[PDB]
Design an enzyme around this catalytic site. Sequence first.
Site, PDB file in Angstrom:
ATOM      1  N   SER A 180      -2.456  -2.118  -3.472  1.00 24.85           N
ATOM      2  CA  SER A 180      -3.463  -3.153  -3.331  1.00 24.85           C
ATOM      3  C   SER A 180      -4.489  -2.717  -2.296  1.00 24.85           C
ATOM      4  O   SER A 180      -4.122  -2.067  -1.312  1.00 24.85           O
ATOM      5  CB  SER A 180      -2.809  -4.460  -2.899  1.00 24.85           C
ATOM      6  OG  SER A 180      -1.826  -4.822  -3.843  1.00 24.85           O
ATOM      7  N   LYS A 214       5.225   9.428  -4.531  1.00 21.28           N
ATOM      8  CA  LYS A 214       3.799   9.757  -4.471  1.00 21.28           C
ATOM      9  C   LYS A 214       3.621  11.087  -3.773  1.00 21.28           C
ATOM     10  O   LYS A 214       2.818  11.925  -4.206  1.00 21.28           O
ATOM     11  CB  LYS A 214       3.056   8.674  -3.689  1.00 21.28           C
ATOM     12  CG  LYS A 214       2.971   7.380  -4.468  1.00 21.28           C
ATOM     13  CD  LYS A 214       2.383   6.317  -3.558  1.00 21.28           C
ATOM     14  CE  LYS A 214       2.231   4.984  -4.211  1.00 21.28           C
ATOM     15  NZ  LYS A 214       1.975   3.916  -3.148  1.00 21.28           N
TER      16      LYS A 214
END
Lengths: 200, 200, 200, 200, 200, 200
Positions: B91, B134
């Site tokens: 976000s 990631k």
Amino acid sequence: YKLFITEGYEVGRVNGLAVIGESAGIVLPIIAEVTPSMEGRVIATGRLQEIAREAVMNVSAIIKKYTGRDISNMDVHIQFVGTYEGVEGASASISIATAVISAIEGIPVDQSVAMTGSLSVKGEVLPVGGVTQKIEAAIQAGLKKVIIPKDNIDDVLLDAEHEGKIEVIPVSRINEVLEHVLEDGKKKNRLMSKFKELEL
Amino acid sequence: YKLFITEGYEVGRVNGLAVIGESAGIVLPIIAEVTPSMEGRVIATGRLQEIAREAVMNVSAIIKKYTGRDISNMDVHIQFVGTYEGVEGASASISIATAVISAIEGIPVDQSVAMTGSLSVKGEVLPVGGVTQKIEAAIQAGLKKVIIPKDNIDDVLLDAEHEGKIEVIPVSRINEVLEHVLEDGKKKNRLMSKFKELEL
Amino acid sequence: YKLFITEGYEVGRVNGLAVIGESAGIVLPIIAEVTPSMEGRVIATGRLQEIAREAVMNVSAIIKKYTGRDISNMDVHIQFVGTYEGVEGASASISIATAVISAIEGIPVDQSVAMTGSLSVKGEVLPVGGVTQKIEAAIQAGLKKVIIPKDNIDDVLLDAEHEGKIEVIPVSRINEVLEHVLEDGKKKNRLMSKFKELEL
Amino acid sequence: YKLFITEGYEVGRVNGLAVIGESAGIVLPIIAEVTPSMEGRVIATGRLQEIAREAVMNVSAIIKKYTGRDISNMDVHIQFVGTYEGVEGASASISIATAVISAIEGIPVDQSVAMTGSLSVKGEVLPVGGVTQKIEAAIQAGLKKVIIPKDNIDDVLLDAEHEGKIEVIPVSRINEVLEHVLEDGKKKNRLMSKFKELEL
Amino acid sequence: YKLFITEGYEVGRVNGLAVIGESAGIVLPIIAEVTPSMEGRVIATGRLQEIAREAVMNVSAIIKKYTGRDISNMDVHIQFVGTYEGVEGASASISIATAVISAIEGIPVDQSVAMTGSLSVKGEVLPVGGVTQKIEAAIQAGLKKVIIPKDNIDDVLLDAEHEGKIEVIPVSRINEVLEHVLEDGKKKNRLMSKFKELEL
Amino acid sequence: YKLFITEGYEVGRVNGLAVIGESAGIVLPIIAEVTPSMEGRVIATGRLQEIAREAVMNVSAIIKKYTGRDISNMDVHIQFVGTYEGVEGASASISIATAVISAIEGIPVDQSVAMTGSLSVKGEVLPVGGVTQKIEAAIQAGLKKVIIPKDNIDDVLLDAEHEGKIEVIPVSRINEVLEHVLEDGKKKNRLMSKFKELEL
């Protein structure tokens, strides 16, 4: 990691409480920033944007009436930390209102407090739903205090093992929320002097 | 071919990191462009458009507060390179924010760095999920550095053979991301001087 | 009959290339029209509508930045000729972008050229998949030239009997595509002068 | 009974032609109505609804560009008379487009004509499949004329006993279809004057 | 018991006629309700739901054009009484259309009438199949009147002992159906005045 | 054990009656739950799922019209207790409708009552088949009361030794069912006041 801070003081940030589904309470951290408008705008995105716009307009009335800050000529940014599906927030949430006042005034907020309640344009804190669920969430988050509307004190169906893993602080007006969460100091004192007319 | 660039400098382009499914990390290159609004718009299409709108509004607060750029009177275009089903992005992604600042300021970004993190409207870099996945993706892509939120440093469950095929750079604030990725020069120096108040 | 034109010049029409299934290349003719908005809309229907919306928004950035055309106040209609199941198009397709620029500027496009590539919001032509399959399709269609991204030149696995039944034209930026396909004349010259800043 | 009208003039109604299975041609009557939107909608139900939406969006481009009618602020209803399984209609069908123009302008259409063809957003009539089968269907229906795309004239494999039980009218552009089917009068003349720029 | 009412007046309820198998006619009572949408929806379940959706969209055109009711902002519920396998209903059935108009306007419908026919978006009543079978069913149900499309009057192959156990009422337009079935009064008069333009 | 409860009050649960084979009546307990939709869905599985979907859509009309509850934004779960082969349920069953109203309103239902009947979208209770068989089943289950449609009172072919081992309650409208089965109290009173317009 956690999306909320649970101790110490931060400008512009408040741990609000919300409900997901019917009764799953969650901590809903709010962060606010105010900038000069360079006709100011309320900037919010996502599912809770209407709740945000309403809270900022209501607190703007109180900010104009009592402190004289020119909030119509500021951009107010509202961020909700953690994007959850099917959150319901308290209308005109006091956590958003408190985040805005903190951001405009530059006075840090106690992160060890969570709060829920609906702000009236007159400065009252109005009752809301799901208070037990929201308190439990704050307990699970390991917060130390929770602010709730006075009219919801009967609405706390704790447990016997949960009373009290948290301090409950009932409130009827916004100046009370600010007394309980703003960092003590000269700036807080000046601000609270401006709300004496709200007390009266 | 590759959808990302892995060395050298480019204006407006950042290698972000995302998750697909639950734990398949991917490099998610972002490209931004800003144009005069000819009331500016954020223009983004597709699945991640809300993540893009949120990131641009949050970085707009910081751009207005600290650099004084009139971003409300600019159109901001956000492109995600490679359209993958079921990507989840951080976000208010710091990669989108960095791409925007690079595009407005005309200062190239190091393509050898990847980054993940959530930008607060106050300029903080907030923790995010899937940091190990990631990082692995950045390792597989042959990137040289990865920026992650400070609060996620404990969250790196590398391997023994992966520590360290990549430099990990923890950050708490947006000015740190910019120090680490913007090409050195006079424009970068001027910009960083404007963020000294954010440091303070 | 054929759904594509293979020689001469037409405003607003471009032979793009796409993939159906995994590797069956097809010629995908695009036709664009732009009208005053009478807040403009991108109008596209069917399976490839998202690819169309993305391509038009990306080329809009470049149209606003470099030519100053008010594309936000235009309706842009994108038509794909021939409705095939399971077509995959290049994201932000350069054929759609070229069709739009041709339609706005009123400058015909060479129908003897086919093209594939992904347009960045910065004006770059990004690499795409299935380049060999798409080239073969153009060869089968009896086209004379094919524009592909520079980064895909290694990706042409022609044959020995197919090199060269077609001229391959590698490109890195949108102004190159336009130099190669727009009809020569004063309007093309004026337009290309506006892209000199993109070259730089 | 019959589902189509075969002589005289009717506003909003056109005899289109379609294919069922591979080569069974059928007359496919279309009826259109346009209403104020009270952001207009295209309203169509059933199997051919996408074909309908595409045809209305394409003709909307031409209606906006050349006649200036505000079709984005109208609801457009498309009805196909007779619900047949496995009909295939021409993409962006000229019969739907003609029905819409007739309905907006209030100018009746010749029911003794049938037509097939694909409308481009630029106003061209593009070639379609199954032209022989569709012509035969019109012959069986006892229609007097059939409009087909110019590029399909070679595609008429009539018979020796069928040439000519019907007048074939080849077309390249939408204004030609309208010259051939709209009732003569002042309204038709005004409309055709607006398409002179399409001729040019 | 019976699933249909055969005498008196009821809001929102119409005796339609349908075919099961090839030629077994049945009375198919329809009940409609309209509610505020609280973007309205057509709500129908089961085998005949597409027939229902089509009928409601077509009558919506006429309701918007002639009466100005905001039907796009209403939920329209269509119920078929008695769930029979392999019913075929008239496309865009006039019974569904009449039920909707009755429900929106609050004007009761004569239960002693049955009807069959297909509604055009222009307000015409189009011919349908199985008219003899459907009439027989109405006769067996002891209905007093049956409305059929004008174009189907030749299609009534009664008997010699069945002509006439029922009054047959041929119609060409929806306003005629409404004149014949809506309860007389001021509301019916007002409504019919709005359809005078349809007559014209 | 038993699959139904035969005395006392329960939210969301109703003893419906059904037929298996041709004439073996059974008690068919229904349980409903409503949740926020987090565009709501009706969730039902198995053989009777269509009967469930129809009943929920019909009662939704009445819930929207008279009580103003936003049922389109709720998920409605319907469970049938005991999975029997070849059950036939009443279309748009009043037991499902009652279970839904009980679940939304939080008002318990009398388990000593069984009911059968078909709900119209207008709120009427329509006649159904197999009423004698269903009554016998309720008698065998030791229920105290049975609600049946008014139009089926002639259809009760009891016995001489069965009249009356059960109270039969005829109904014509849904508000009557609710008066007879909902637990008395303030919530029931408020609800019934909202149906006074249905009585009228």
